[PDB]
Amino acid sequence: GHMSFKNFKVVEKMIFGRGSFVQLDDVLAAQRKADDDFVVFLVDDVHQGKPLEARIPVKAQDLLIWVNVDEEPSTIQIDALTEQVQAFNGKLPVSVVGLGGGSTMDVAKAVSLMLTNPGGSAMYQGWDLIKKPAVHHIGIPTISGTGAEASRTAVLCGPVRKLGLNSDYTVFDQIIMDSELIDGVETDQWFYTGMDCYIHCVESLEGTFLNEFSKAYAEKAMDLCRQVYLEDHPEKDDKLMMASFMGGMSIAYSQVGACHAVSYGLSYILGYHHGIGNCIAFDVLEEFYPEGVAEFRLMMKKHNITLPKNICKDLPDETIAKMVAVTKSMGPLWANVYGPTWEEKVTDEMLTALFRRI
Amino acid sequence: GHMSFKNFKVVEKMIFGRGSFVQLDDVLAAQRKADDDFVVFLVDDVHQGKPLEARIPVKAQDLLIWVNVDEEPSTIQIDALTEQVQAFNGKLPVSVVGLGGGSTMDVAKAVSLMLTNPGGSAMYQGWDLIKKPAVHHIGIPTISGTGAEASRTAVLCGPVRKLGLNSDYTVFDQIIMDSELIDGVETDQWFYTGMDCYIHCVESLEGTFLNEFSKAYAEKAMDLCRQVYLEDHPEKDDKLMMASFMGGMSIAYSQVGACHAVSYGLSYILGYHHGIGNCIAFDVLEEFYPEGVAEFRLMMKKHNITLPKNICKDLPDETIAKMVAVTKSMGPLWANVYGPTWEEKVTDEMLTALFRRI
Ligand SMILES: NC(=O)c1ccc[n+]([C@@H]2O[C@H](COP(=O)([O-])OP(=O)(O)OC[C@H]3O[C@@H](n4cnc5c(N)ncnc54)[C@H](O)[C@@H]3O)[C@@H](O)[C@H]2O)c1
Ligand SMILES: NC(=O)c1ccc[n+]([C@@H]2O[C@H](COP(=O)([O-])OP(=O)(O)OC[C@H]3O[C@@H](n4cnc5c(N)ncnc54)[C@H](O)[C@@H]3O)[C@@H](O)[C@H]2O)c1
Ligand SMILES: [Cl-]
Ligand SMILES: [Cl-]
Ligand SMILES: [Cl-]
Ligand SMILES: [Cl-]
Ligand SMILES: [Zn+2]
Ligand SMILES: [Zn+2]
C-alpha cells in the first residue's frame, strides 16, 4: 500500500461577474433537451417581493419553491421538498437551482441528491454514502461567505444533529457568482456570514492539518476579508464573493478548529445560526486566536456590530454540559488546534468556562 | 440579447501533495476497464535516467514516449505523435499522461485531442474549433510556473506561428501536483519558468481587462512568487507549484500584456524559449512595469541570474521588422496595456527601440 492524498473534486464550471445572473436562463436552456423539461428553483424566501424575484427565469413548466431559512436546513425538510418535486412531475427535473445563502444552496445540493438516491437524507449523512450522481445542480449565492457554493457537503440537521452529506456527487455542476445579488444584504448578516469566511481562515491557518494549497487559498481569502471589513473599496461585493469562493476552495487540505467546535454546541443546543454563532464563539477565543480576535474586534467597531452577550450566564448546568459534550466530541477539530495530545487539553472544565463567557 | 461572461471550465479533479505521484497508478487503474486497456505516457526526456523514470507506473501494454523539448511543441510533432499512438494499437488509450513542463503537458493535451478529432492539429489552432471530447488526460508538472496544468489551451508552433488549441475540451481531466518532482530543476530554468508566472501576474494586474476573480488569483500567485524568489521558505517548491496553479486559474478573466507580446516576437523569429524569452523581454520594459521590473531585477541578483544581452544589436533591420510586425499584431494584449486607443502608442518605432535594447 501507499498513503493517499485526497483527490479533490471542484465545481467544474463557473461564471464570475456582476450582472451574470442574466446568463442563468441560457445555462438552463442547455439542459432542457425536451420542450417540457423542467427546472426546480429553490430560492431563499427573502427574495420574495424584491427585485430579484421578477428576474428568476421561471418557465410555465418549472417549479419554484420559496425556501424559508428561519431555521437552517434539516433532513425532514429535505425529504419533504424531494417528495414535493416527485409529486410535481413524473420526470426528473433537468436541473436544480439553489438561489440563496449557504442554507438554500445546501437545500438545493441535498434535493438534487435525494431525487436520485432513495431512503431519505439522514441515511446519507456521513462520508461518501451517496451511491448515484445527483440531478444537475447550480449554485447562485445571494449572500457571501460560507463557501458552500464550492464545497462537497450539504449540512443538514438530522434526527440527532447537524452533519453533512459529504460526497463528490454533492458538488455543484455550475456556480454563478454575481455580486449584484449580495449588494442589498443588511449590515449585521453581511458581517456574520462574511465572518464565517474570515474565522474559518484564521482557524485553518493555525491548524496542524494544512498544506500550501489550502494555505494560499485561506491567506488570500483572509486578505480579501480584511479589504472588505477594514477598508473601503468600490469592489467590496466582488471581493467578498471572491473571498467566499477561495475559502471554499481551501477546505480540501485544511480543517476548522476551536471556533467551529464551540459554535457547533451553540447551534445544536441553543439554535444559534451558523454565522452569528461563530462570531459569538470567536469573541471568547482570544487565547486560541489572539491576532484574529483582535482584528475581528476592530472590524466589529468599524461596522457598529454588537454581539449579544450573557447568553449562557443563567442557563442550567445541564444545558451547558450538553454543549460541552457536543463540542468536546469534535476530535478532528481539536486535533487541528493542539495535535494528537488534544484530549489532555480539551476538558469539560476548559469548555464550560468558554460557554459561561458567551 | 444580453452580454455574456465566460463560463470558465476548470480541471475537475486534483491531487496536491509531496509524494502524490505514487497515486498516479490508482488513478490510471480506474480508467482501465479491460485487462488490456492501455495508457500513453508523454514524458519530458529530461527524466530519462533520473530517479523519476523508474517510478512511472508503465504497464506491459502501455506506450511510453520520451518527448524532446529542445524545441517547443509543433503541429507536425503533435501529428506524428498521434499517428504513433494510432499505429501502436487499434484501441484508443484510456488516458494520456503529460509528465513534464508546459511543453510536455501541452503535447499531452494536444495528442489526447487529436486522437478523437481528425484532420491534423493546425486545423484546430484557434478558439473552440475542437468538435469532440479528448481522450481522458492527466497533467503532472515537473517544472512549475506556466500554469499549463490549469489552462484551456495547448500552444503549438503551426505552419506559420505559435497559436493554441483553445477549447473546454483541452482542459486536463485530472492534475497531480507533487512538488517533489520539481526539487531538482536547475537554478536558471527554475527562475525562467517561475518568472513566467510572476511576469504574467504583473501584466495581468496592470491590465484594462481584469476582474476581482482574476485579480485575487494573480495577486496571490505573485505573493507566492515573492516568497520563492526573494525569501527562503522550507516549502519553496510547494509554494511555487501553488503559484503556478493560481496563475493558471487567473487566465479566465484577465490577459497578458507587453512582455508576452514582445517575447512572442523573440520566440517566433529567433526561437527563444517561452520562459527565458519573457525574462529577456521584461528587462527592457521598465517604462511599462516599473515596480515589477525592479523587483524582478532584485530576484535575479538574489539568484545570480545573468540574462543574455546584445541579442538584437547586430541583427538585420529586416529581422527586427519581422519581430516588430508579429508583436504589433497582438491587439488584445496591447488593448490590455493601453485601452482602446492602443494603436496610437504601439508604433513600429516604439517596438523597434525595445527590440534593439535586447
Ligand atoms: N455546505 C457547506 O460547505 C457549508 C459551509 C459553511 C456553512 N454551511 C451552512 O450554511 C448555512 C448558513 O449559511 P449563510 O451564513 O449564508 O446564511 P443563510 O443561508 O441561512 O442566510 C442567512 C440570512 O440572510 C438572508 N439572505 C440571504 N440572501 C440575502 C440577500 N441577498 N439579501 C438579504 N438577505 C439575504 C437569509 O434570508 C437569512 O435570513 C448553515 O446551515 C451552515 O450549516 C454550509
Ligand atoms: N498551455 C498553456 O496555457 C501555456 C501557458 C504558458 C506557456 N505555455 C507553453 O509552455 C511551454 C514552456 O513550458 P515550460 O516553461 O515549463 O518549459 P518546458 O516544458 O519547455 O521545459 C523547460 C526545460 O526544463 C526541463 N525540465 C522539465 N522538468 C524538469 C525537471 N524536473 N528537472 C530538470 N529539468 C526539467 C525541460 O526538459 C526543458 O529543458 C511553451 O511551449 C509555452 O508556449 C503554455
Ligand atoms: Cl422549505
Ligand atoms: Cl440565531
Ligand atoms: Cl517528440
Ligand atoms: Cl532559448
Ligand atoms: Zn463555517
Ligand atoms: Zn507565459
Side-chain angles (χ1 to χ4, degrees), chain A residues 1-2 4-358, chain B residues 1-2 4-358:
Chain A
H2 53 263
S4 281
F5 299 91
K6 180 189 276 136
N7 196 168
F8 178 37
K9 189 203 188 208
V10 292
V11 172
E12 185 190 78
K13 288 173 102 186
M14 24 201 216
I15 297 161
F16 188 103
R18 288 179 67 86
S20 64
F21 189 75
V22 75
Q23 306 177 215
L24 172 59
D25 181 58
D26 296 325
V27 169
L28 296 171
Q31 304 305 310
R32 301 177 192 273
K33 308 320 295 203
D35 282 354
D36 61 343
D37 271 334
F38 83 100
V39 170
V40 176
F41 302 84
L42 291 156
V43 184
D44 188 328
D45 70 20
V46 77
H47 300 303
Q48 181 163 33
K50 286 180 186 255
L52 180 59
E53 180 180 3
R55 295 176 63 205
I56 302 160
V58 181
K59 312 295 174 169
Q61 59 274 42
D62 288 343
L63 179 58
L64 169 62
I65 303 173
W66 297 105
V67 180
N68 189 272
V69 299
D70 288 350
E71 308 209 311
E72 297 179 338
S74 63
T75 54
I76 286 167
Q77 172 189 27
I78 297 335
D79 296 349
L81 292 170
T82 303
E83 289 186 293
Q84 184 183 172
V85 172
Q86 286 165 331
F88 177 82
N89 195 276
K91 297 193 294 306
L92 290 165
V94 296
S95 194
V96 178
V97 180
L99 179 63
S103 295
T104 301
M105 288 188 275
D106 281 3
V107 166
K109 283 164 151 177
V111 172
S112 79
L113 282 167
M114 294 308 86
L115 290 166
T116 58
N117 288 271
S121 58
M123 139 175 211
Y124 299 100
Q125 293 182 289
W127 300 81
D128 198 27
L129 296 177
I130 300 292
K131 296 186 178 88
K132 298 246 95 97
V135 171
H136 187 276
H137 56 297
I138 306 177
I140 315 182
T142 71
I143 175 174
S144 287
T146 53
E149 61 275 16
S151 76
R152 300 183 332 109
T153 193
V155 184
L156 301 181
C157 182
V160 194
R161 267 172 65 242
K162 267 184 168 273
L163 190 54
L165 306 180
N166 303 274
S167 173
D168 283 7
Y169 294 139
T170 303
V171 184
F172 284 116
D173 300 272
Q174 174 80 240
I175 60 180
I176 298 171
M177 290 176 289
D178 179 348
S179 73
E180 297 181 349
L181 299 188
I182 73 172
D183 287 327
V185 172
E186 315 257 44
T187 309
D188 287 337
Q189 189 62 53
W190 156 77
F191 188 82
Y192 303 151
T193 297
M195 286 302 107
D196 193 21
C197 181
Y198 177 83
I199 291 169
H200 193 314
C201 294
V202 166
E203 290 172 292
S204 285
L205 284 171
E206 298 302 313
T208 59
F209 177 70
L210 188 64
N211 75 3
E212 289 295 315
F213 181 106
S214 282
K215 181 165 178 173
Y217 274 118
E219 289 183 342
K220 188 49 178 188
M222 183 166 76
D223 173 68
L224 288 153
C225 293
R226 293 168 166 169
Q227 296 173 51
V228 172
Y229 294 106
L230 294 172
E231 304 174 342
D232 185 28
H233 295 264
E235 317 87 348
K236 64 180 67 58
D237 285 336
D238 271 345
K239 288 168 184 298
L240 183 61
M241 183 161 279
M242 194 55 181
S244 180
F245 175 74
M246 291 185 130
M249 285 295 295
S250 83
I251 290 170
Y253 300 113
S254 72
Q255 184 54 280
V256 288
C259 192
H260 282 64
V262 169
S263 177
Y264 189 104
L266 296 172
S267 137
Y268 174 70
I269 303 314
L270 301 173
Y272 275 93
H273 284 236
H274 186 67
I276 188 169
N278 301 333
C279 288
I280 286 170
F282 200 55
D283 212 32
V284 303
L285 296 173
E286 62 278 64
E287 276 175 9
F288 293 78
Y289 306 118
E291 297 169 2
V293 173
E295 183 160 84
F296 160 83
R297 285 173 182 168
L298 299 181
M299 294 168 173
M300 284 197 294
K301 277 207 323 125
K302 250 242 166 34
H303 301 281
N304 302 111
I305 304 294
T306 283
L307 287 173
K309 294 268 80 141
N310 299 308
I311 289 157
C312 297
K313 206 181 47 158
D314 296 337
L315 299 173
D317 285 8
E318 185 192 359
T319 300
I320 305 298
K322 290 169 197 208
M323 296 187 296
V324 169
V326 182
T327 291
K328 190 191 206 198
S329 69
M330 328 253 53
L333 282 52
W334 290 112
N336 199 37
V337 170
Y338 288 116
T341 69
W342 64 271
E343 288 152 292
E344 88 200 28
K345 285 68 160 205
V346 182
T347 61
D348 295 347
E349 186 181 355
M350 187 277 291
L351 293 177
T352 304
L354 291 176
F355 284 111
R356 292 284 184 193
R357 289 164 60 223
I358 286 167
Chain B
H2 53 263
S4 281
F5 299 91
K6 180 189 276 136
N7 196 168
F8 178 37
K9 189 203 188 208
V10 292
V11 172
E12 185 190 78
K13 288 173 102 186
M14 24 201 216
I15 297 161
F16 188 103
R18 288 179 67 86
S20 64
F21 189 75
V22 75
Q23 306 177 215
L24 172 59
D25 181 58
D26 296 325
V27 169
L28 296 171
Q31 304 305 310
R32 301 177 192 273
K33 308 320 295 203
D35 282 354
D36 61 343
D37 271 334
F38 83 100
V39 170
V40 176
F41 302 84
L42 291 156
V43 184
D44 188 328
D45 70 20
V46 77
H47 300 303
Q48 181 163 33
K50 286 180 186 255
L52 180 59
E53 180 180 3
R55 295 176 63 205
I56 302 160
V58 181
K59 312 295 174 169
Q61 59 274 42
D62 288 343
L63 179 58
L64 169 62
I65 303 173
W66 297 105
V67 180
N68 189 272
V69 299
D70 288 350
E71 308 209 311
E72 297 179 338
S74 63
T75 54
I76 286 167
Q77 172 189 27
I78 297 335
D79 296 349
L81 292 170
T82 303
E83 289 186 293
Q84 184 183 172
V85 172
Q86 286 165 331
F88 177 82
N89 195 276
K91 297 193 294 306
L92 290 165
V94 296
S95 194
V96 178
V97 180
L99 179 63
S103 295
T104 301
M105 288 188 275
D106 281 3
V107 166
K109 283 164 151 177
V111 172
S112 79
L113 282 167
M114 294 308 86
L115 290 167
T116 58
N117 288 271
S121 58
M123 139 175 211
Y124 299 100
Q125 293 182 289
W127 300 81
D128 198 27
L129 296 177
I130 300 292
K131 296 186 178 88
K132 298 246 95 97
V135 171
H136 187 276
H137 56 297
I138 306 177
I140 315 182
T142 71
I143 175 174
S144 287
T146 53
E149 61 275 16
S151 76
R152 300 183 332 109
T153 193
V155 184
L156 301 181
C157 182
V160 194
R161 267 172 65 242
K162 267 184 168 273
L163 190 54
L165 306 180
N166 303 274
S167 173
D168 283 7
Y169 294 139
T170 303
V171 184
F172 284 116
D173 300 272
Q174 174 80 240
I175 60 180
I176 298 171
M177 290 176 289
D178 179 348
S179 73
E180 297 181 349
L181 299 188
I182 73 172
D183 287 327
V185 172
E186 315 257 44
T187 309
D188 287 337
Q189 189 62 53
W190 156 77
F191 188 82
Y192 303 151
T193 297
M195 286 302 107
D196 193 21
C197 181
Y198 177 83
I199 291 169
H200 193 314
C201 294
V202 166
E203 290 172 292
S204 285
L205 284 171
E206 298 302 313
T208 59
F209 177 70
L210 188 64
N211 75 3
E212 289 295 315
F213 181 106
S214 282
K215 181 165 178 173
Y217 274 118
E219 289 183 342
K220 188 49 178 188
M222 183 166 76
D223 173 68
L224 288 153
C225 293
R226 293 168 166 169
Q227 296 173 51
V228 172
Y229 294 106
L230 294 172
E231 304 174 342
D232 185 28
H233 295 264
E235 317 87 348
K236 64 180 67 58
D237 285 336
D238 271 345
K239 288 168 184 298
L240 183 61
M241 183 161 279
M242 194 55 181
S244 180
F245 175 74
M246 291 185 130
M249 285 295 295
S250 83
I251 290 170
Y253 300 113
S254 72
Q255 184 54 280
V256 288
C259 192
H260 282 64
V262 169
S263 177
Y264 189 104
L266 296 172
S267 137
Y268 174 70
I269 303 314
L270 301 173
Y272 275 93
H273 284 236
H274 186 67
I276 188 169
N278 301 333
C279 288
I280 286 170
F282 200 55
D283 212 32
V284 303
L285 296 173
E286 62 278 64
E287 276 175 9
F288 293 78
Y289 306 118
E291 297 169 2
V293 173
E295 183 160 84
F296 160 83
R297 285 173 182 168
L298 299 181
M299 294 168 173
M300 284 197 294
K301 277 207 323 125
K302 250 242 166 34
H303 301 281
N304 302 111
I305 304 294
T306 283
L307 287 173
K309 294 268 80 141
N310 299 308
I311 289 157
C312 297
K313 206 181 47 158
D314 296 337
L315 299 173
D317 285 8
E318 185 192 359
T319 300
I320 305 298
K322 290 169 197 208
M323 296 187 296
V324 169
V326 182
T327 291
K328 190 191 206 198
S329 69
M330 328 253 53
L333 282 52
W334 290 112
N336 199 37
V337 170
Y338 288 116
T341 69
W342 64 271
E343 288 152 292
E344 88 200 28
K345 285 68 160 205
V346 182
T347 61
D348 295 347
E349 186 181 355
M350 187 277 291
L351 293 177
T352 304
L354 291 176
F355 284 111
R356 292 284 184 193
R357 289 164 60 223
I358 286 167

Short mmCIF file of all heavy atoms in Angstrom, two decimals, chain A residues 282-291 293 297 338 350 354 357:
data_model
loop_
_atom_site.label_atom_id
_atom_site.label_comp_id
_atom_site.label_asym_id
_atom_site.label_seq_id
_atom_site.Cartn_x
_atom_site.Cartn_y
_atom_site.Cartn_z
N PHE A 282 -16.26 33.18 18.63
CA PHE A 282 -14.89 33.71 18.38
C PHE A 282 -14.48 34.79 19.39
O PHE A 282 -13.30 34.87 19.79
CB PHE A 282 -14.86 34.30 16.95
CG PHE A 282 -13.51 34.46 16.35
CD1 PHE A 282 -12.63 33.37 16.26
CD2 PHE A 282 -13.13 35.69 15.83
CE1 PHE A 282 -11.37 33.53 15.68
CE2 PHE A 282 -11.89 35.84 15.25
CZ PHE A 282 -11.02 34.76 15.17
N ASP A 283 -15.47 35.56 19.85
CA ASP A 283 -15.20 36.65 20.77
C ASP A 283 -14.76 36.15 22.16
O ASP A 283 -14.28 36.97 22.93
CB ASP A 283 -16.40 37.59 20.88
CG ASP A 283 -16.00 39.02 21.14
OD1 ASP A 283 -14.93 39.52 20.70
OD2 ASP A 283 -16.81 39.68 21.82
N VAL A 284 -14.82 34.86 22.47
CA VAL A 284 -14.26 34.35 23.75
C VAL A 284 -13.01 33.50 23.55
O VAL A 284 -12.55 32.79 24.46
CB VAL A 284 -15.35 33.58 24.54
CG1 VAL A 284 -16.55 34.45 24.81
CG2 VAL A 284 -15.80 32.33 23.82
N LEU A 285 -12.43 33.60 22.34
CA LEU A 285 -11.37 32.69 21.94
C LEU A 285 -10.08 33.43 21.74
O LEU A 285 -9.20 32.92 21.06
CB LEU A 285 -11.72 31.83 20.71
CG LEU A 285 -12.88 30.86 20.92
CD1 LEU A 285 -13.28 30.17 19.61
CD2 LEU A 285 -12.55 29.79 21.95
N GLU A 286 -9.93 34.59 22.36
CA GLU A 286 -8.66 35.31 22.31
C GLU A 286 -7.41 34.52 22.71
O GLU A 286 -6.34 34.74 22.13
CB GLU A 286 -8.76 36.74 22.89
CG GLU A 286 -9.14 36.95 24.36
CD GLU A 286 -10.63 36.92 24.74
OE1 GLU A 286 -11.28 35.85 24.59
OE2 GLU A 286 -11.16 37.96 25.24
N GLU A 287 -7.50 33.56 23.62
CA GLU A 287 -6.35 32.70 23.93
C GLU A 287 -6.01 31.72 22.80
O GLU A 287 -4.86 31.34 22.67
CB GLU A 287 -6.56 31.90 25.21
CG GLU A 287 -6.21 32.68 26.46
CD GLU A 287 -6.52 31.94 27.75
OE1 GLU A 287 -6.87 30.74 27.73
OE2 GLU A 287 -6.40 32.60 28.80
N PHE A 288 -6.97 31.32 21.99
CA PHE A 288 -6.69 30.45 20.84
C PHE A 288 -6.19 31.23 19.63
O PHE A 288 -5.26 30.80 18.95
CB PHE A 288 -7.91 29.65 20.46
CG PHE A 288 -8.30 28.64 21.51
CD1 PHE A 288 -8.97 29.04 22.66
CD2 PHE A 288 -7.97 27.31 21.36
CE1 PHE A 288 -9.33 28.13 23.63
CE2 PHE A 288 -8.31 26.38 22.33
CZ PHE A 288 -9.00 26.80 23.46
N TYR A 289 -6.78 32.40 19.37
CA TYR A 289 -6.50 33.12 18.13
C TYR A 289 -6.33 34.59 18.43
O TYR A 289 -7.17 35.40 18.03
CB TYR A 289 -7.66 32.86 17.14
CG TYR A 289 -7.98 31.40 16.87
CD1 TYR A 289 -9.23 30.87 17.19
CD2 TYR A 289 -7.06 30.53 16.31
CE1 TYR A 289 -9.57 29.55 16.95
CE2 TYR A 289 -7.39 29.20 16.06
CZ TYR A 289 -8.63 28.72 16.40
OH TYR A 289 -8.97 27.41 16.15
N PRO A 290 -5.26 34.95 19.17
CA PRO A 290 -5.20 36.33 19.67
C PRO A 290 -5.23 37.38 18.58
O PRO A 290 -5.94 38.38 18.72
CB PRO A 290 -3.90 36.38 20.51
CG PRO A 290 -3.16 35.13 20.23
CD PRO A 290 -4.14 34.13 19.67
N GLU A 291 -4.50 37.19 17.50
CA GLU A 291 -4.46 38.23 16.48
C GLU A 291 -5.78 38.36 15.72
O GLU A 291 -6.26 39.47 15.46
CB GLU A 291 -3.28 38.03 15.52
CG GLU A 291 -1.99 38.13 16.30
CD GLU A 291 -0.75 37.69 15.54
OE1 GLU A 291 -0.81 37.30 14.36
OE2 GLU A 291 0.33 37.73 16.18
N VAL A 293 -8.80 37.48 16.73
CA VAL A 293 -9.84 38.03 17.56
C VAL A 293 -9.65 39.53 17.70
O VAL A 293 -10.64 40.25 17.67
CB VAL A 293 -9.90 37.33 18.91
CG1 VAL A 293 -10.86 38.01 19.86
CG2 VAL A 293 -10.39 35.93 18.71
N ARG A 297 -12.38 42.20 16.29
CA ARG A 297 -13.00 43.21 17.14
C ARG A 297 -12.89 44.61 16.56
O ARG A 297 -13.81 45.41 16.73
CB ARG A 297 -12.40 43.16 18.56
CG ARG A 297 -12.93 41.98 19.35
CD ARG A 297 -12.20 41.86 20.69
NE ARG A 297 -12.69 40.69 21.40
CZ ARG A 297 -12.13 40.14 22.48
NH1 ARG A 297 -11.02 40.66 22.99
NH2 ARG A 297 -12.69 39.08 23.05
N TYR A 338 -4.54 21.41 18.57
CA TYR A 338 -3.50 21.06 19.52
C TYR A 338 -2.59 19.90 19.11
O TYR A 338 -1.58 19.66 19.76
CB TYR A 338 -4.18 20.55 20.79
CG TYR A 338 -4.88 21.55 21.65
CD1 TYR A 338 -6.25 21.48 21.83
CD2 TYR A 338 -4.18 22.55 22.31
CE1 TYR A 338 -6.91 22.36 22.63
CE2 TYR A 338 -4.83 23.45 23.13
CZ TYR A 338 -6.20 23.33 23.29
OH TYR A 338 -6.90 24.19 24.08
N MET A 350 -12.42 23.39 30.88
CA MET A 350 -11.97 24.44 29.94
C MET A 350 -13.17 24.83 29.06
O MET A 350 -13.44 25.98 28.88
CB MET A 350 -10.78 23.91 29.10
CG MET A 350 -10.09 24.94 28.19
SD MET A 350 -11.02 25.11 26.63
CE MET A 350 -10.65 23.52 25.95
N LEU A 354 -15.54 28.54 28.72
CA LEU A 354 -15.79 29.30 27.48
C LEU A 354 -17.28 29.59 27.30
O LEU A 354 -17.71 30.70 27.04
CB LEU A 354 -15.30 28.48 26.28
CG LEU A 354 -13.78 28.32 26.14
CD1 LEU A 354 -13.38 27.43 24.96
CD2 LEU A 354 -13.05 29.63 26.00
N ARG A 357 -18.72 32.28 29.37
CA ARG A 357 -18.38 33.63 28.95
C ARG A 357 -19.21 34.21 27.81
O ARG A 357 -19.13 35.40 27.58
CB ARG A 357 -16.90 33.70 28.61
CG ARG A 357 -16.03 33.60 29.87
CD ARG A 357 -14.57 33.29 29.56
NE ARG A 357 -14.11 34.39 28.72
CZ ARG A 357 -13.36 34.29 27.63
NH1 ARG A 357 -12.90 33.11 27.25
NH2 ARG A 357 -13.04 35.40 26.97
#
